[PDB]
Every structure is written in C-alpha cells, then in structure tokens.
C-alpha cells in the first residue's frame, strides 16, 4: 500500500545495489499527478526547497512522507514525465530584490515578464522569512494617504500597518488601490525621503489582460517609480500563484529594511488561498473547513504580519499591507474574510448598494473601521475628519427616518440635510486622487456648513469649482495647510473669508 | 512514437492504461482500437508501473481488461483551416454533420499556453449589438471576454441567438460557435437557422461560422475538452489568419461539471461545494487562452450557466473574475415579465468609462442604475403601506423608474414566436436619447405599458397613441 513501493524501484533495489543515482542530490520522478510530483530520492533535500526538473523546469518541494518528497511543479505539467531526474538547487527559493525592480512588471520567481529587458537585481532575499518581532517594530507614526476622501477622512491608513480592502466583486476595490498608487506621484516627485514611496501591486490569479490594463493605467498616469507589479495570473500554475504575495512582500521587506517606506496591494488574496487549497488537497493534506486546510490562517498571518513601522534604530522603514478580498454576496462570515479580518489592523468595507445608489467610490461604511484611524492623520484632517465622522455617525442612524423626513421636526431635518451634503462630498471621480490639502479644504467647507442651503445635485459641481478656485487663486493657503500640517486660526479665518465670498459668488 | 499499451481498468472516462515501453506525457491522446468506432483518451497522471490515468470521451460500454491502445504524440490534434467552416465537428476532430471527411492540409493541437504578457492587446473599443440594456448599461468590447450569466429558463439561449444573428451577420470576418454541453435540439435549430439565414453555405466555401458542438450526453472528457476545441479553431482564425474573429461559447458550466465528474472518479479530494480543486487553475488556462492578442483580435461571448440562480457558486464567481463585461440574466424580472430578465444592477463593464464611451452615455447609464437601485428600497417602503405616503417626488421617481424598467425590454428578432411581436433594431444614439428623454421628464404622463415592448422612443409614442386613441 506504500507510495514508494513500486516494482521499478524495488527491482532496481534488489537486482543489485545501485549507488549510482546517488539518491540524495538527485531523485527520480515517481507518480506525477495533476500538478504535483511525488519524487523518490532527495534524502538531503530540506523542506520548502526549490528543486529543478530535467525538462528545464523548477518546482518547490514540500511533503517528505518518510520515503517521498512532495514537489509541486512551477509550471505546466504536460512536460514532466515519470522517471525524470530532479536536481537540488540547494536553497529555499529566493526573490531578486533591489531598487532596479522598479517600473518593471515581474513574475513571482522574480523574472521579467513584460519583455522590456531583464532585471538588474544585486541581491536576492530569501522568501518566507520570519516577521520582525515586538521590539524592532513600532506603531503607525506616519499618515498613509489614499487620496480617497472617504478613506483618508473616516478610515485613514497608517504608514506602518495593514488595511484590508473588502467587498463584493466589481465594487470598487481595485480602483481604490490604483488611486492609492497614483496619489503617491506628488510625494515621489520631490524631496523628503520619509515621504517618497514604493508601491507593489501583487496580482494573484487575475486575467492577464487586466494586468496589462493596470500597467497601462499606471504608465499613462506615470506611476512607475514607486511601483513594482508582481503578476501571477490565472493561466499560471497553482504554486506560482501561491508564492506571488511572499515575493512582493519580500521586495517590500527589502524596501523597509533600507530605511525607505513601502506599501503592497495584494489583489485577490482570496485567490491565493484558493491556489493553496488546490495544491494542498492534491498533496492530500487533510482539509479543514470549506476544504481549506489547517494552516490557512497561519499562511495569511505569516504573509500579512510583515507590515509594521520600524524603530529609529532599524532605519525608519515602514510597510503598509493592503489585502483585497472578494466576498460572495456580503458573506463576511466565510472562512477567508473572517481569517483576514481577524489578522488585519483595519478594514475598508464596500457594501454595493451604495455603488449602485450612486455614491462612488463605493466605500459603504458602518461596518468599515480602522483600529488606529485617528492617530494616523495630519492634524488638519484629524480635526475636520473627527467632526465629520461624528456628524455622519449622527446621520446614518436616521436615514430610514429621512425617507419620511419631510413631516418630522426641524432638528432632525437639519442633521439629515448636513449628512446628505457630507455624504455627497465623499464621492469622488475614478483615477483622480485628491491631495490632503484640497480635501481638507472641501471637507472643512462641509463641516462648517456653507453647503446646507445648496441643492443636493449641485454639491459635486461646487466641489469641482471649489477645487479649481482654490488651486488657481489661493496656492499659498494650501501651502500653509501642507507645511504647517494643520489649520492654525489664520487658515481658519482665511477659509471663513474665501468660502463666504465664493458662496456669495457661486451661481 | 506510436507506442502501444494495455487498458487494464475501466470506469467511464477514467481508464487506467499500463505502459512499459513508451510512456506518453500528461494531456495526451490515446487511440483505443477494438471498437468499431475510434476511442480517444486524454492522458493524465502516470501513477506507476507506468500508468496513465486517462479520461475516455466516448461511452466505455464494452472495453476489455487488457486492450491494445496506440500512443501518438498529440495533446489532441484536430483538422483546422478555412475548410472547417460550414461543418460541425466534435472534440476528437471528426465531422458529425454526415458530409464526408474534412479535407484540410494543416492540423492544430488542443493544448497550448496562454500566449505571453507582452502580446496582450491594450485597446478597448465599444461594441454595439443593438440591444438596449446591453448598449447603455453594459456595453460590449470588440476584443473582450463578454459573459452573460443566468439560471435555467432566464433567456441565455435566446440572447445568444440574438447576438449570433445581430452580430455574426454584422461581421465581415469569421465566427466560431462552441456548443459545450448544449442540448441537441437548440444546437440543431442553430444549425438549421444558420443554413437558412445563409451564414452557412452548403454549396461552396462562402461560409463564415465554424461550428464545434459536443452534445450534453457525452462522457466528461468529451464535454470538458470541446470548449478547448472551439478555442483552438478560433485561435487559428486569430493567430495566423489575420482576421477579427468572434467565438460564442455556450455554456461554460458543463466544463466545470465535467471536471467535477472526472475529479470524483480520478482520485482527487473534493474541494468546496463539490467541484474539483483545480477549478480556478483549469478554467484560468482555458479562459486566458481566449483573449485578444497583438497578432489578431478575438471577441468571445460566453453563455455561462449558474445552478438555480446561485451566483456564489465558486465556478460562476471565478468566471466573473475572468470576464470583461458580464450581463446577469435574472429570472425575477421575467416573473415581472421583462425579457430577458436582465440584471444591469449586477452587470459589469470594463468599457464603461467617461473617456471610452462618452460623458452623455455614462451619465445616462449611471442615472438609470441610480434610479433603479433607489426603486428597490423605495419599493420596500411601498410594500407595507402602499402608494399613499411616499411624497410627490418619491412617487414621481417610483413611477419614472418603473417606466424605465419597462423600457429596458426589447423584442428580439429571433424571439418573434414567444411573444408574437416582430422585433426591432435599436442603435446606440437612439438608446441614449430615449433614456435621457425619460430621465429628462418628457414622458411622465404616458402609462407604463406604452414603454413595454418597444424599440426606439418613436415606437413608445406610437404604442401610446394606439392605447389612447
């Protein structure tokens, strides 16, 4: 009943002592399944270790069950045959990292796929290293600005943390990632090393044409200085989609060990869980719940808890993880959304009735929360977003009473009106991230309540005209806001004056 | 190369063959002799003493333990050319239209890699099919994976007939139909309607659709790989023909059913709901082979079954992950009476952006979706008390949204026998003007049944004049 007990290796064992295949560095391929070889030999291989197949392929080896090495094939299983010769490489699989990976779409073993030349990497980091502990890291001390006003006001991100974008399929959720990338152009144009940034978009099991659309959007927004795009599409193999987030996270770990800041966007991390379930169930590892095996939480935690700000001794480098989860019709109670919501330090939740109700971007909150999302803000946005969050918290209770709000009292009517103006301030066009200074100005206008008399369909037109007016005329005021970091009574008085005058001359 | 082997264990498709001289690699083709027909085997895993575990495509009634198979070096090779146009072939490569053999010169191998990242095209141009709810709420893409989901009895086959008619006649290039486990009479009506409409010409080589049809009662190796046969034919019409080609795969859920059936029998642990663990990987291969490249432009409309209107089944969810512009074909709006019961509130588009299509089209589409989404919560407000207390404006937008939702219905030309109405063609600009004219407040007085089964807004005017006087 044994797996290695077949008459081929038994016959070559008892017809005469071989000592010829060496059984330790090499190994002959036994039963090759749909994507998993169970090779015989490799007595000196270690666990999770990348071997190569004589076709010219690679493949990483797990389960070792006392006579057999469970090597999962890094490619198509058409050209691996029974009896082929495997060879050890000698090391757990590495990822070529460096500052030469930037602006070039690569593939999860660290090899170039866009065909515009090879990667000029100088050092290879071992993938799947342990996360840094308690003392080497510190908390979120820098504000990570998405550019989305709803996110940067209500649920801001911190340079130093992990923030799980969660929603149904085609409910924003990658547009927020592309806005998070394109927002960092203005911080990567100039000075301040502790502001400049490196985005890493790890696409796991997407279509490959949408990765081409993603990289064309980033190139014509000139988003290829900050960015690396790691891509393991749906045509690629199951273990190469499994190993894609750890590769990009190793690149980001290179960026945060050397002082600099970085973020990573794990697009379709649920598909990484699906690929791991595929390869484990074909390794006949015992399935846990929904056929996901035991160490799936251990997988996503070992992936996601590598993101933290570092103390001033260990550079000042920080990482920001942004995993992405498709839920199936709001089923937040599934296996993978419950696992990653228990892992991650915040969630950005997108319920979709807001999207088709016409408030885009689709961050439909109340379930959405950031567990550190007050200290990860500039004091301008801290003040304005604190008052704005309390106003929306008073608004969202009474909206079912606002569908019949016409025949109620006046205090509600004022509160619900202010909430409607703020909720239509939070909507924003796609692929146009706002800087912190102008969104502080807009949400300031909404909080101080120079909008309560206007029509609802005229709020967004006011928003665009107010952006044009404040960018064109009052450059120095946005300079005050972005250099002081806050409104200190003179920006307050000047904004009183300019918003009263522009409301006097709007129509 | 042609190495002989012994069938030793037979269960359906899953047939174990023992090779001891020459072992064929995985995903191959074995010709079982001894049958009066040919039997083909898709070679998979090699378990030992060399053992291929193959899946057998024809019915295995009558396979002896210890039969002789022949081994060729083919993944599986099919006749492919301009000769295979007006003729129906099945997955092995053989004609089932009873018109002799297919005389071609070069063949093609069914299994290939999805091409490369550097060959992926980047252009996105709108495709207008003449259907209202498609043209404004989920427009198509010349060079994009169009998918239309639905349960059973929602109208996917009538919609795919309307697309085949209204697009394959409005196409100078070629077409490829792939009936992947579609029932035999609907494909038969397709073949006879194609002959009588003239897109298949039985007299000479003036045809422009190539049909690959695997019936719904074949073993799962013949019902999974027939989609790949359609992919191979339409790849040749895209790779080195140099032609804009469109492929209609109806109905890729038999692919996943076939994979789940063999994975039950191959010896693999069942995944989530009961499908194979290799669902996302296998469908990733066969849905990333089908995309437009820099060499040629190929557009793929896919009729995709969901089981009993369950969109959270993992195979429709991963199919959503592969598309570019889906279209949900619900049932509830046909319990209302709108056909096909299209959900645009669950439909997507990569093509719908204010720079791609326009600002006018985008704003009227988002206005229609905004007023239909608001109509749901407002209708649930109605459902307890009624039309009494909503408001002036609230009752006005309820009636306006209901009028729009009745205006989404459109009589198909191929479905002039289900409703009796003759069926019309609507251009894009007319759909934009009609929905912008209903949102603009022009038609607040006409009844809801005046907009029900119409084409342009002039047809709604004529039906309102017919109902009134």
């Amino acid at each position: 009943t044994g797996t290695a007990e077949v008459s081929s290796i038994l016959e070559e064992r008892i017809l005469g002592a071989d000592t010829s295949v060496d059984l330790e560095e090499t190994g002959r391929v036994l039963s090759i399944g749909d994507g998993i070889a169970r090779v015989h030999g490799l007595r000196n291989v270690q666990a999770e270790e990348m071997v190569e197949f004589s076709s010219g392929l690679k493949g990483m080896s797990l389960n070792l069950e006392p006579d057999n090495v469970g090597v999962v094939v890094f490619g198509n299983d058409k050209l691996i045959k029974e009896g082929d010769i495997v060879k050890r490489t000698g090391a757990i699989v590495d990822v070529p990292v460096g500052e030469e990976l930037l602006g070039r779409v690569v593939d999860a073993l660290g090899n170039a796929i866009d065909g515009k030349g090879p990667i000029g990497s100088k050092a290879r980091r071992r993938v799947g290293l342990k996360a840094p502990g308690i003392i080497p890291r510190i908390s979120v001390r820098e504000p990570m600005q998405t550019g989305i006003k709803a996110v940067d006001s209500l649920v801001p991100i911190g340079r130093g943390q992990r923030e799980l974008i969660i929603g149904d399929r085609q409910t924003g959720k990658t547009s927020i990632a592309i806005d998070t990338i394109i927002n960092q152009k203005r911080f990567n144009d100039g000075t301040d090393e502790k502001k400049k940034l490196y985005c890493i978009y790890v696409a796991i099991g997407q279509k490959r044409s949408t990765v081409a659309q993603l990289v064309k959007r980033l190139t014509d927004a000139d988003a290829m200085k900050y960015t690396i795009v790691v891509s393991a599409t749906a045509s690629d193999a199951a273990p190469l989609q499994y190993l894609a987030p750890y590769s990009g996270c190793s690149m980001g770990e290179y960026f945060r060990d050397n002082g600099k800041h970085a973020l990573i966007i794990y697009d379709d991390l649920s598909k990484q869980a699906v690929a791991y379930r595929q390869m484990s169930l074909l390794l006949r590892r015992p399935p846990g719940r929904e056929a996901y095996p035991g160490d799936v939480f251990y997988l996503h935690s070992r992936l996601l808890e590598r993101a933290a700000k570092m103390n001033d001794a260990f550079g000042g480098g920080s990482l920001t993880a942004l995993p992405v989860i498709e839920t199936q019709a709001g089923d937040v109670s599934a296996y993978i959304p419950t696992n990653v919501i228990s892992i991650t330090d915040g969630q950005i939740f997108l319920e979709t009735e807001l999207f088709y109700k016409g408030i885009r971007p689709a961050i439909n909150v109340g379930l959405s929360v950031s567990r550190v999302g007050s200290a990860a803000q500039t004091r301008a946005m801290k003040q304005v977003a604190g008052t704005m969050k309390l106003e929306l918290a008073q608004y969202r209770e009474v909206a079912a009473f606002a569908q019949f709000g016409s025949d109620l009292d006046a205090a509600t009517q004022q509160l619900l009106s202010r909430g409607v103006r703020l909720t239509e301030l939070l909507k924003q066009g796609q692929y146009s991230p706002m800087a912190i200074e102008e969104q502080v100005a807009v949400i300031y206008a909404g909080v101080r309540g120079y909008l309560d008399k206007l029509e609802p369909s005229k709020i967004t037109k006011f928003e665009n005209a107010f952006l044009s007016h404040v960018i064109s005329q009052h450059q120095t005021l946005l300079g005050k806001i972005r250099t002081d970091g806050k409104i200190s009574e003179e920006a307050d008085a000047k904004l009183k004056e300019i918003v009263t005058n522009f409301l006097a001359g709007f129509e | 190369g042609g190495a002989t082997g012994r069938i030793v264990a037979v269960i359906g498709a899953v047939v174990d063959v023992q090779f001891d001289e020459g072992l064929p690699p995985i995903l191959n083709a074995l010709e079982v002799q001894g049958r009066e027909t040919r039997l083909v085997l898709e070679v998979a895993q090699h378990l030992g003493e060399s053992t291929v575990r193959t899946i057998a495509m024809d019915g295995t009634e009558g396979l002896v333990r210890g039969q002789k198979v022949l081994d060729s070096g083919a993944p599986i090779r099919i006749p492919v050319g301009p000769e295979t146009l007006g003729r129906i072939m099945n997955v092995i490569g053989e004609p089932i239209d009873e018109r002799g053999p297919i005389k071609t010169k070069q063949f093609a191998a069914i299994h290939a890699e999805a091409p490369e990242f550097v060959e992926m095209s980047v252009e996105q141009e709108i495709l207008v099919t003449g259907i209202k709810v498609v043209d404004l709420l989920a427009p198509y893409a010349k060079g994009g994976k169009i998918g239309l989901f639905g349960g059973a009895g929602v109208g996917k086959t009538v919609l795919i007939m309307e697309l085949i008619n209204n697009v394959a006649k409005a196409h100078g290039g070629y077409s490829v139909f792939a009936g992947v486990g579609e029932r035999t009479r609907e494909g038969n009506d397709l073949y006879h309607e194609m002959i009588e409409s003239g897109v298949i010409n039985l007299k000479d080589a003036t045809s422009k659709v190539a049909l690959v049809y695997g019936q719904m009662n074949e073993p799962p190796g013949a019902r999974a790989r027939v989609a790949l046969t359609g992919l191979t034919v339409a790849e040749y019409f895209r790779d080195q023909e140099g032609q804009d080609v469109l492929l209609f795969i109806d109905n890729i859920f038999r692919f996943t059913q076939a994979g789940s059936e063999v994975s039950a029998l191959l010896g693999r642990i069942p995944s989530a709901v009961g499908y194979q663990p290799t669902l996302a990987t296998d469908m990733g291969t066969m849905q990333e082979r089908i995309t437009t490249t820099k060499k040629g432009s190929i557009t793929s409309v896919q009729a995709i079954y969901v089981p009993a209107d369950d969109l959270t089944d993992p195979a429709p969810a991963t199919t959503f992950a592969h598309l570019d512009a889906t279209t949900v074909l619900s049932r509830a709006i046909a319990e209302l009476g709108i056909y096909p019961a299209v959900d645009p509130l669950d439909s997507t588009s990569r093509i719908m952006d204010p720079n791609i299509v326009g600002s006018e089209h985008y704003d009227v589409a988002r206005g229609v979706q905004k007023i239909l989404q608001d109509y749901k919560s407002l209708q649930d407000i109605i459902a307890i008390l009624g039309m009494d207390e909503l408001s002036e404006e609230d009752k006005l937008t309820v009636s306006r949204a209901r009028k729009i939702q009745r205006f989404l219905s459109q009589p198909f030309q191929v479905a002039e026998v289900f409703t009796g109405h003759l069926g019309k063609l609507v251009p894009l600009k007319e759909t934009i003007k009609g929905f912008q004219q209903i949102l603009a407040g022009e038609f607040d007085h006409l009844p809801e049944q005046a907009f029900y089964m119409v084409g342009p807004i002039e047809e709604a005017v004529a039906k309102a004049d017919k109902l009134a006087e």
């Binding site: 079912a400 009473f401 | 307890i384």
Partner: peptide, 25 residues
Amino acid sequence: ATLKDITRRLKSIKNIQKITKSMKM
C-alpha cells in the same frame, strides 16, 4: 429552510421594522 431564503426573509423584516419605526415617529 435554505440559507438564501432566510437571508431574504431577514432583509425583508429588518426593512419592515425600520419603516415601522419611521411610521411610529
């Protein structure tokens, strides 16, 4: 019952409960 049926039923009665509080106010 099935799961989606009870999800539909809970959605319907949560909406009826909110609208009935609205009628109460």
